[PDB]
Structure formats: structure tokens, C-alpha cells
Design a protein around this ligand. Structure first.
Ligand SMILES: Nc1nnc(-c2ccccc2O)cc1N1CCC[C@@H](Oc2ccccc2)C1
Length: 113
């Protein structure tokens, strides 16, 4: 797998996350694009040791920082676990975080097989 080929794969995986809509038609990715401000939400950074967001993941795809699909999955897992730590089970953020993971792993299995 060439770097250029891998990049296309990772772009597809990210694309599936950011175009995914809920049953209501809303785009679940939007809240996860950019980390919450440190001024307004210090508690987030009190709790989350490794903040990450989809814009950072997107930069890393664009910079070639991921050397495999698994590398990108690690950051997807980190992002969802961070969300599921700061927010309660069943809260919309918690549920959307799982949905993003779901979308990623489904599309990863679609590509890998
Ligand atoms: N809750 C959040 N949880 N994770 C993130 C997050 C963003 C990017 C990447 C990983 C993440 O975990 C952002 C979040 N907020 C943004 C919107 C405002 C505030 O949330 C509220 C506030 C009041 C009521 C309901 C929700 C903070």
C-alpha cells in the first residue's frame, strides 16, 4: 500500500464520518470537529489528558502522519473515549461518539474486504 493509496483510504474513512446523518437528518460529526475552548470549558481539559478532534485527525491524514489504517483507528478510539468520559452515558454527545465509531469501523470493514 503506497502512501498515496493509504491517504485515499483514510480520506474515505473520514468522509464517511463527516457526512453521516442521524435518523433526523442532522450531521453527527459537527460537534467533534473542533475541541471545546479552554477558556469556556477548563473542566474538559481537567479531565481529558489527550484532547483530540476531527480537524486534527484531518490534518494528520493530510500530512501523512498515519502510517496505517490502524494508526487512524487509534485516534478515532481516543476521540470517542474522551467524549464518553466527559459526557454521561445516554447523553447526545456520548451516543454520537459511539455512532462515529460505528460509522468508522463499518466503513473500514467495507474497504478491507
Ligand atoms: N460536551 C462536549 N463533549 N465533547 C466535546 C468534544 C469536541 C471535540 C472532540 C472531542 C470532544 O469530546 C465537545 C463538547 N462541548 C461542545 C459543545 C458545548 C459543550 O457541551 C455541552 C454543554 C452543555 C450542554 C450539552 C453539551 C462542550
Amino acid at each position: 500500500m503506497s502512501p498515496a493509496y493509504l491517504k485515499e483510504i483514510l480520506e474515505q474513512l473520514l468522509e464517511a464520518i463527516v457526512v453521516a446523518t442521524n435518523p433526523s437528518g442532522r450531521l453527527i460529526s459537527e460537534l467533534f470537529q473542533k475541541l471545546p475552548s479552554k477558556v469556556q470549558y477548563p473542566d474538559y481539559y481537567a479531565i481529558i489528558k489527550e484532547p483530540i478532534d476531527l480537524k486534527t485527525i484531518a490534518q494528520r491524514i493530510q500530512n501523512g502522519s498515519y502510517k496505517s489504517i490502524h494508526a487512524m483507528a487509534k485516534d478515532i478510539d481516543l476521540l470517542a473515549k474522551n467524549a464518553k468520559t466527559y459526557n454521561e452515558p445516554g447523553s447526545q454527545v456520548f451516543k454520537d461518539a459511539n455512532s462515529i465509531k460505528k460509522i468508522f469501523y463499518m466503513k473500514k470493514a467495507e474497504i478491507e474486504h
